[PDB]
Scaffold this active site. Structure first.
Site, PDB file in Angstrom:
ATOM      1  N   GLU A 260      62.837 -53.267  52.589  1.00  0.00           N
ATOM      2  CA  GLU A 260      61.945 -52.799  53.639  1.00  0.00           C
ATOM      3  C   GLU A 260      62.448 -51.641  54.482  1.00  0.00           C
ATOM      4  O   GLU A 260      61.899 -51.365  55.557  1.00  0.00           O
ATOM      5  CB  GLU A 260      61.517 -53.977  54.528  1.00  0.00           C
ATOM      6  CG  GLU A 260      60.698 -55.027  53.754  1.00  0.00           C
ATOM      7  CD  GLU A 260      59.991 -56.045  54.647  1.00  0.00           C
ATOM      8  OE1 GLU A 260      60.323 -56.114  55.853  1.00  0.00           O
ATOM      9  OE2 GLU A 260      59.111 -56.782  54.133  1.00  0.00           O
TER      10      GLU A 260
ATOM     11  N   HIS B 136      65.572 -59.829  50.535  1.00  0.00           N
ATOM     12  CA  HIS B 136      65.186 -58.406  50.537  1.00  0.00           C
ATOM     13  C   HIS B 136      66.402 -57.467  50.488  1.00  0.00           C
ATOM     14  O   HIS B 136      66.243 -56.244  50.460  1.00  0.00           O
ATOM     15  CB  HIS B 136      64.401 -58.041  51.811  1.00  0.00           C
ATOM     16  CG  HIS B 136      63.098 -58.758  51.973  1.00  0.00           C
ATOM     17  ND1 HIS B 136      62.313 -58.612  53.099  1.00  0.00           N
ATOM     18  CD2 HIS B 136      62.442 -59.625  51.168  1.00  0.00           C
ATOM     19  CE1 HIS B 136      61.229 -59.358  52.979  1.00  0.00           C
ATOM     20  NE2 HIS B 136      61.283 -59.983  51.816  1.00  0.00           N
TER      21      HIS B 136
ATOM     22  N   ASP C 181      54.371 -68.103  58.778  1.00  0.00           N
ATOM     23  CA  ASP C 181      54.134 -67.174  57.663  1.00  0.00           C
ATOM     24  C   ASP C 181      53.933 -68.017  56.404  1.00  0.00           C
ATOM     25  O   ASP C 181      52.798 -68.224  55.975  1.00  0.00           O
ATOM     26  CB  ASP C 181      55.314 -66.192  57.496  1.00  0.00           C
ATOM     27  CG  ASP C 181      55.182 -65.307  56.243  1.00  0.00           C
ATOM     28  OD1 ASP C 181      54.053 -65.061  55.779  1.00  0.00           O
ATOM     29  OD2 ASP C 181      56.215 -64.844  55.720  1.00  0.00           O
TER      30      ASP C 181
ATOM     31  N   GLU D  10      59.965 -65.908  63.231  1.00  0.00           N
ATOM     32  CA  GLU D  10      59.053 -66.238  62.139  1.00  0.00           C
ATOM     33  C   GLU D  10      59.740 -67.192  61.158  1.00  0.00           C
ATOM     34  O   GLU D  10      60.933 -67.062  60.885  1.00  0.00           O
ATOM     35  CB  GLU D  10      58.647 -64.952  61.409  1.00  0.00           C
ATOM     36  CG  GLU D  10      57.604 -65.134  60.300  1.00  0.00           C
ATOM     37  CD  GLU D  10      57.419 -63.871  59.445  1.00  0.00           C
ATOM     38  OE1 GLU D  10      57.365 -62.754  60.005  1.00  0.00           O
ATOM     39  OE2 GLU D  10      57.324 -63.996  58.206  1.00  0.00           O
TER      40      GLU D  10
ATOM     41  N   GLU E  77      64.768 -60.870  58.189  1.00  0.00           N
ATOM     42  CA  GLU E  77      64.434 -59.670  58.960  1.00  0.00           C
ATOM     43  C   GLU E  77      64.930 -59.649  60.407  1.00  0.00           C
ATOM     44  O   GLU E  77      64.859 -60.658  61.113  1.00  0.00           O
ATOM     45  CB  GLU E  77      62.901 -59.493  58.949  1.00  0.00           C
ATOM     46  CG  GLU E  77      62.321 -59.544  57.530  1.00  0.00           C
ATOM     47  CD  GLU E  77      60.805 -59.522  57.476  1.00  0.00           C
ATOM     48  OE1 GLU E  77      60.162 -59.193  58.500  1.00  0.00           O
ATOM     49  OE2 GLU E  77      60.257 -59.825  56.390  1.00  0.00           O
TER      50      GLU E  77
ATOM     51  N   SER F 238      59.692 -63.187  49.089  1.00  0.00           N
ATOM     52  CA  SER F 238      59.840 -64.552  49.591  1.00  0.00           C
ATOM     53  C   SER F 238      58.438 -65.050  49.874  1.00  0.00           C
ATOM     54  O   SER F 238      57.968 -65.063  51.025  1.00  0.00           O
ATOM     55  CB  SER F 238      60.674 -64.586  50.867  1.00  0.00           C
ATOM     56  OG  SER F 238      60.203 -63.638  51.798  1.00  0.00           O
TER      57      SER F 238
ATOM     58  N   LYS G  25      48.751 -61.846  56.262  1.00  0.00           N
ATOM     59  CA  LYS G  25      49.020 -61.159  54.993  1.00  0.00           C
ATOM     60  C   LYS G  25      47.798 -61.325  54.090  1.00  0.00           C
ATOM     61  O   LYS G  25      47.603 -62.383  53.494  1.00  0.00           O
ATOM     62  CB  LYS G  25      50.245 -61.769  54.305  1.00  0.00           C
ATOM     63  CG  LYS G  25      51.573 -61.309  54.905  1.00  0.00           C
ATOM     64  CD  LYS G  25      52.751 -62.100  54.359  1.00  0.00           C
ATOM     65  CE  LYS G  25      54.092 -61.446  54.746  1.00  0.00           C
ATOM     66  NZ  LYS G  25      55.275 -62.305  54.360  1.00  0.00           N
TER      67      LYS G  25
ATOM     68  N   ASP H 269      62.615 -62.747  61.378  1.00  0.00           N
ATOM     69  CA  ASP H 269      61.880 -63.445  60.343  1.00  0.00           C
ATOM     70  C   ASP H 269      62.994 -64.089  59.543  1.00  0.00           C
ATOM     71  O   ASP H 269      63.705 -63.424  58.781  1.00  0.00           O
ATOM     72  CB  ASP H 269      61.062 -62.530  59.441  1.00  0.00           C
ATOM     73  CG  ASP H 269      60.348 -63.310  58.343  1.00  0.00           C
ATOM     74  OD1 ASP H 269      60.390 -64.556  58.397  1.00  0.00           O
ATOM     75  OD2 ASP H 269      59.748 -62.699  57.431  1.00  0.00           O
TER      76      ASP H 269
ATOM     77  N   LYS I 100      53.990 -55.776  61.845  1.00  0.00           N
ATOM     78  CA  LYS I 100      55.292 -55.497  61.261  1.00  0.00           C
ATOM     79  C   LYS I 100      54.960 -54.881  59.894  1.00  0.00           C
ATOM     80  O   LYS I 100      54.223 -55.467  59.084  1.00  0.00           O
ATOM     81  CB  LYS I 100      56.138 -56.766  61.107  1.00  0.00           C
ATOM     82  CG  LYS I 100      55.666 -57.759  60.065  1.00  0.00           C
ATOM     83  CD  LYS I 100      56.727 -58.839  59.869  1.00  0.00           C
ATOM     84  CE  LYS I 100      56.566 -59.545  58.528  1.00  0.00           C
ATOM     85  NZ  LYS I 100      57.585 -60.620  58.348  1.00  0.00           N
TER      86      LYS I 100
ATOM     87  N   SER J 247      50.727 -58.059  58.798  1.00  0.00           N
ATOM     88  CA  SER J 247      51.934 -57.785  58.031  1.00  0.00           C
ATOM     89  C   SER J 247      51.747 -57.219  56.617  1.00  0.00           C
ATOM     90  O   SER J 247      50.760 -57.494  55.930  1.00  0.00           O
ATOM     91  CB  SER J 247      52.757 -59.084  57.956  1.00  0.00           C
ATOM     92  OG  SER J 247      53.909 -58.979  57.130  1.00  0.00           O
ATOM     93  N   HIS J 248      52.732 -56.422  56.214  1.00  0.00           N
ATOM     94  CA  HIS J 248      52.821 -55.828  54.886  1.00  0.00           C
ATOM     95  C   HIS J 248      53.495 -56.909  54.050  1.00  0.00           C
ATOM     96  O   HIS J 248      53.674 -58.033  54.519  1.00  0.00           O
ATOM     97  CB  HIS J 248      53.772 -54.635  54.936  1.00  0.00           C
ATOM     98  CG  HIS J 248      55.142 -54.982  55.452  1.00  0.00           C
ATOM     99  ND1 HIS J 248      56.235 -54.152  55.292  1.00  0.00           N
ATOM    100  CD2 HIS J 248      55.589 -56.061  56.143  1.00  0.00           C
ATOM    101  CE1 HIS J 248      57.292 -54.707  55.862  1.00  0.00           C
ATOM    102  NE2 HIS J 248      56.928 -55.866  56.386  1.00  0.00           N
ATOM    103  N   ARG J 249      53.855 -56.580  52.811  1.00  0.00           N
ATOM    104  CA  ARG J 249      54.645 -57.504  51.989  1.00  0.00           C
ATOM    105  C   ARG J 249      55.917 -56.674  51.737  1.00  0.00           C
ATOM    106  O   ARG J 249      55.897 -55.455  51.930  1.00  0.00           O
ATOM    107  CB  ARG J 249      53.973 -57.841  50.649  1.00  0.00           C
ATOM    108  CG  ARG J 249      52.745 -58.739  50.734  1.00  0.00           C
ATOM    109  CD  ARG J 249      52.911 -59.863  51.765  1.00  0.00           C
ATOM    110  NE  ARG J 249      53.955 -60.850  51.469  1.00  0.00           N
ATOM    111  CZ  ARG J 249      53.761 -61.974  50.779  1.00  0.00           C
ATOM    112  NH1 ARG J 249      52.559 -62.260  50.285  1.00  0.00           N
ATOM    113  NH2 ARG J 249      54.755 -62.852  50.635  1.00  0.00           N
ATOM    114  N   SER J 250      57.008 -57.310  51.319  1.00  0.00           N
ATOM    115  CA  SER J 250      58.239 -56.575  51.040  1.00  0.00           C
ATOM    116  C   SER J 250      57.997 -55.614  49.853  1.00  0.00           C
ATOM    117  O   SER J 250      58.659 -54.571  49.717  1.00  0.00           O
ATOM    118  CB  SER J 250      59.395 -57.554  50.765  1.00  0.00           C
ATOM    119  OG  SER J 250      59.115 -58.437  49.687  1.00  0.00           O
TER     120      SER J 250
END
Ligand code: MG
Ligand code: MG
Ligand code: MG
Ligand code: MG
Lengths: 432, 432
Positions: B209, B157, B317, B292, B166, B39, B342, B244, B393, B369-372
């Site tokens: 995730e 996701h 985000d 988020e 999320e 996303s 990100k 999120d 996260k 943050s990570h990415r999915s």
């Protein structure tokens, strides 16, 4: 040459504690982590858990970590043993534990150190890890394995009705390892669409090893889904199928329950003859060339009988538990013709290599494997290349505890360059 | 000091290709890989894909890898730039690309090198990575963040109707980071039982995730399940909830579709006021302290209004896309009060630190943050510690592309020893 060793508790791919070990030499820091299975055979070496119900539901490994920090490390540092002496170091730890199944320190404790030592030894020799493993195993050559991707998960690895554990695709017809990965990835993404179109979005979530978890009960349908995805991706002529039944998981006092995830009902249990008849139909209708754990870890009669009439690769996993003694009995009885090699089923790098050579000396194939509970460690990638077995199963091409291994194999192929060899159609025995 | 740079295509956690970069200095090899979101906001720097539909369904990144190998690498190697000069190197790359959204090389090509340079810089200085980041960011202190575990997955996701993306748990009440991990894991495992008991095993498979993907539609039910798991695990006093929404994913010409994964039907769409009130009910009935992307990436009016009346942390985000220019507008209008950081949304370590500092200088919280779509790379673990944001996260405690980061955070806490600090309940502003 071992200057220091320190162990710690980290998390595996399922969110459970496991052992990680840091080993230092003058060449630097060497780290390794230990995998953990879900469908573990009764004969596996002991995975020591704390069993403190208040902490991680009894799954802590602080005890194993402590055996390392307080006992194994000081001992190994004192002996001033060189990291390139894998066998001596492993034997020392085995002697210190003093039990048949490593029940004093825990196989997870000894393997963590054993793995870190092996990586250190490679650097000490100034050679890639797979080349080091090759020297330890007495192999002059090295080759890329055909990967076996577990794209539909069942059994104890997923929340579906599907009893059989793993539905795998092997790109034996690929020209090299990178194409094998391409085929694996493209078939997987096509399979996602095939499952989505037929069962809906709720069927596209994944299991422990990254394979899709459609809520189907029929194992045959899983095979049909693979066949459809392979066709859709256009690789029907380059892909064969492998399966891990993990029959010890649904063994029911002599019979087998292919619906063991539903409330128990003895009326549906089938005999091993009926189970064999099912495998025979699979082999007949689909390009299934390998079946792992078709029967219970000690249902020796069924194994012998099936393998004698099969025509395909039959893999012992819980039957043999990477244990030379169990393997020897299996070779003599002709229980199977391939060994699933899981380093944590026996507990040391040296014993794992001995199990592999034993299988090979008897003409068996060997498939290196991960555990359903993995970590970011990629040791098995170098292991399968150095042992030249030609086959490895380390997950669907989904979830990085799986891709870390496949990515490392891509790196090994690249480093090997133009001379890189790929098992391909000779995966059962890349030697000959 | 950069001697060689070589890029390659590897696979991320969804089995899609992504960029990996190897960078060499006299100190050795430094390797980094690039994440990829699902996303992704329309304002994110360009993630360059090959779009060759016959290969990886159009998702190969051989063009991005080539941009590094045939253009960026030789330019950087020629300039003989020192790896510790992050800003000069990132700026050179930004200038070479010459486009607003890095669409000539792709943000994935530039970021891959940017990250590897940063890792080489730390070793060049003989200091831990988080320390080097701290230096580049102008921070003297360093601190362990509170982890936010996305334990129930929805939106884009997961395979279910659940529209919101999320559902996270944050152990703000933990004594340190390791206890935060223990609490996260225990609640996660308790949740699997809560879900299993109510919806059956088929509802316990996982999304991208690592969070469970139950077959539910009501977002309130997601929150209710977390609350039950928290209580059952005995941590009602130490855990709060974060969400999120990724509202941009279900934005429909002004309104919002909370069932966007089912066949379209405008009659079910709701207005931003209706969505805002829904969140307020959530904030009223559950310990939700953070939300988020509650609205579309350009529905600025709704954001300002909600942030001014919700009374909680509101994370931008897709609204901000780690872009100083978008962030500047958000600070001026008070569109939100927290920035989701990100690195791949902007494309370089330098712009990421600039975005973080701009947010922090304006009293905003910052959640790394990570990415999915992740990899085995653990850069963001050191990044959040070096940036002292106090919050991160990076997934449920499931799937190693997530645990790799958490495990790295455990190693940093250990390395910091007795002087280690943990944000805990002060995650929004750890350094008072
Ligand atoms: Mg098993
Ligand atoms: Mg097995
Ligand atoms: Mg998003
Ligand atoms: Mg988001």
């Amino acid at each position: 040459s071992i200057l220091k060793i320190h162990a710690r508790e980290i998390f595996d791919s399922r969110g459970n504690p496991t052992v990680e070990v840091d080993l230092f030499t003058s060449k630097g820091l060497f780290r390794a982590a230990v995998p953990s299975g879900a469908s573990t055979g009764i004969y596996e070496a002991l995975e020591l858990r704390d069993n403190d119900k208040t902490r991680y539901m009894g799954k802590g490994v602080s005890k194993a970590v402590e055996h390392i920090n307080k006992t194994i490390a000081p001992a190994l540092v004192s002996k001033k043993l060189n990291v390139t002496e894998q066998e001596k170091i492993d034997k020392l730890m085995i002697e210190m534990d003093g039990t048949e199944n490593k029940s004093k320190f825990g196989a997870n404790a000894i393997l963590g150190v054993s793995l870190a030592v092996c990586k250190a030894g490679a650097v000490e020799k100034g050679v890639p890890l797979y080349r080091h493993i090759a020297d330890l195993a007495g192999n002059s050559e090295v080759i890329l394995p055909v990967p076996a991707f577990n794209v539909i998960n069942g059994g104890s690895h997923a929340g579906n009705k599907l009893a059989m554990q793993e539905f795998m695709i092997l790109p034996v017809g690929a020209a090299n390892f990178r194409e094998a990965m391409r085929i694996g990835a493209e078939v997987y993404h096509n399979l996602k669409n095939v499952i989505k179109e037929k069962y809906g979005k709720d069927a596209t979530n994944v299991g422990d090893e990254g394979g899709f978890a459609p809520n189907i009960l029929e194992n045959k349908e899983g095979l049909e889904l693979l066949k459809t995805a392979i066709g859709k991706a256009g690789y029907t002529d380059k892909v064969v199928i492998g399966m891990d039944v993990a029959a010890s998981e649904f063994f029911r006092s002599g019979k087998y329950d292919l619906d063991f995830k539903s409330p128990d009902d003895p009326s549906r249990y089938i005999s091993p003859d009926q189970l064999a008849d099912l495998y025979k139909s699979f082999i007949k209708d689909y390009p299934v060339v390998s079946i792992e754990d078709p029967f219970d870890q000690d249902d020796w009669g069924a194994w012998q009988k099936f393998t004698a009439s099969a025509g395909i690769q039959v893999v012992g996993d819980d039957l043999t538990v990477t244990n030379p003694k169990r393997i020897a009995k299996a070779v003599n009885e002709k229980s199977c013709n391939c060994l699933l090699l899981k380093v944590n089923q026996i507990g040391s790098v040296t014993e794992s290599l001995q199990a592999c050579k034993l299988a090979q000396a008897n003409g068996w194939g060997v498939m290196v494997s991960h555990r359903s509970g993995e970590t970011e460690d990629t040791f098995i990638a170098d292991l399968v290349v150095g042992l030249c077995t030609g086959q490895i199963k380390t997950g669907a091409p989904c979830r990085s505890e799986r891709l870390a291994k496949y990515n490392q194999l891509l790196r090994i192929e690249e480093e090997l360059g133009s001379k890189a060899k790929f098992a391909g159609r000779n995966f059962r025995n890349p030697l000959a």
